[PDB]
Write a protein that binds this ligand. Structure first.
Ligand code: GLC
Ligand code: CA
Ligand code: CA
Ligand code: CA
Ligand code: CA
Ligand code: CA
Ligand code: CA
Ligand code: CA
Ligand code: CA
Length: 188
């Protein structure tokens, strides 16, 4: 819902913020502290949340643009170089009541929360790895609150958090089919 005096862009995606740093990101706490510490280095619309893979540091050169791919055209600016960096995504996802689980491929770590509760967590650095996470329930059909953080401490980078509604038999990428920046229905 609206919570201030600023109209918010309605689009079929999550609100994305990118933050870079020249300090080391070791874990979720480090990245959240970076987000806390300053304004985003860039904003974007996260409409197709399947990013990377690439090499030679996400925070260098045009690597962020390459990583974000189809979403990069919504960047507010081209950040300068940093050694480390990551993204913070927030908004809504349409889910019917039922049981779900994430399966996430990433380098480095990440955390996804739904309706305030963590549902997929890797609290450390790692080369590319895919985790099938534990199932969670959605009690009421509709737009659920969702946020994500992901970061790269350096080197390679990838982030693809897929979701299953059928007990792990099939998984889908979160994209414009079901994402909403504000919780209103997007017609874009
Ligand atoms: O230790 C974690 C690191 O392992 C390797 O260096 C990977 O290339 C790098 O992307 C990852 O961040
Ligand atoms: Ca607002
Ligand atoms: Ca901030
Ligand atoms: Ca750049
Ligand atoms: Ca891509
Ligand atoms: Ca685009
Ligand atoms: Ca680093
Ligand atoms: Ca990395
Ligand atoms: Ca399958």
């Amino acid at each position: 819902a609206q919570d201030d005096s600023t109209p918010d862009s309605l689009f079929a995606g999550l609100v994305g913020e990118y933050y870079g740093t020249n300090s080391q990101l070791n874990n979720i706490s480090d990245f959240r502290a970076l987000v806390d510490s300053k304004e985003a280095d860039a904003t974007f619309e996260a409409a197709n949340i399947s990013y990377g893979r690439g090499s030679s540091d996400v925070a260098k050169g045009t690597h962020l643009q390459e990583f974000l791919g189809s979403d990069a055209s919504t960047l507010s600016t081209d950040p300068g170089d940093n050694t480390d960096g990551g993204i913070y995504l927030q908004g809504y996802v349409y889910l019917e009541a039922g049981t779900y689980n994430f399966k996430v491929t990433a380098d480095d770590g990440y955390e996804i929360t739904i309706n305030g509760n963590p549902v997929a967590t890797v609290d450390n650095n790692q080369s590319v790895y895919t985790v099938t996470h534990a199932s969670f329930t959605i009690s009421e059909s509709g737009y659920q609150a969702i946020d994500m953080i992901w970061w790269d401490q350096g080197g390679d980078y990838v982030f693809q958090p897929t979701l299953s509604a059928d007990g792990g038999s099939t998984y889908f990428v979160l994209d414009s089919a079901i994402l909403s920046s504000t919780g209103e229905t997007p017609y874009t």
